[PDB]
């Protein structure tokens, strides 16, 4: 169904709120972790959540240390240098909080 689709699972750090081109977003760092071999590779993905409602819902519920499943589009935004991030915005993207214990 999706030409561009990403699915990540990991841990939330660095929750921040702000504005891109006036558009409202909350952003956080998501850290996936893939595992004489034993390949143990970390990857700290930048997640961007867009939407007037959506951005606030994330900031109010998602908290430092949470585990989440994230679903969205891989995109590249520069300014001389290119920035890799992940675009989450309903109904295409999703942040799904996973509750332990």
């Amino acid at each position, epitope marked *: 169904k999706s030409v561009n689709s990403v699915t990540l699972v990991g841990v939330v750090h660095d929750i921040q709120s702000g504005f891109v081109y006036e558009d409202a977003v909350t952003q956080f760092t998501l850290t996936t972790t893939s595992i004489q071999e034993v390949v143990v590779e970390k990857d700290h993905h930048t997640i961007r*959540c867009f*939407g007037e*409602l*959506f951005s606030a*819902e*994330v900031k*109010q*519920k*998602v908290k430092e240390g949470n585990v989440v499943c994230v679903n969205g589009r891989l995109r590249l935004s520069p300014q001389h240098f290119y920035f890799p991030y992940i675009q*989450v*915005q*309903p*109904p295409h*993207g*999703q*942040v*799904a*909080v*996973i*509750h*332990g*214990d």
Partner: nanobody
Amino acid sequence: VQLQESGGGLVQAGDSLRLSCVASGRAFSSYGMGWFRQAPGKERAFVAAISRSGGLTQYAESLKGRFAISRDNAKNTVYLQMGSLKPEDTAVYYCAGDLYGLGSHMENEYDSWGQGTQVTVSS
């Protein structure tokens, strides 16, 4: 804000089963919705939730990947897709509403509640 579960009953272990919660009034589109459950004798436990905008969902760790929550504001309805059943999933399933439009794993944070439906898995 009224709430009514529909689609319980009994079904053979290994089966999927879709549930439905219908909300009366035109406020549904603003309500965070949630699904909780309760097996005979035990406490009522969280299962899934979905925010107003529908982009922020939430899941019980174990009961994740098998279950999927979604909404259709058009029909003022919230659904629960239960992939692959098991005897332990036998319980009475409730739907709940969140005025503040977030959903939570903490039931006490929900203002509205359903009558509850009766899922009963075989074996």
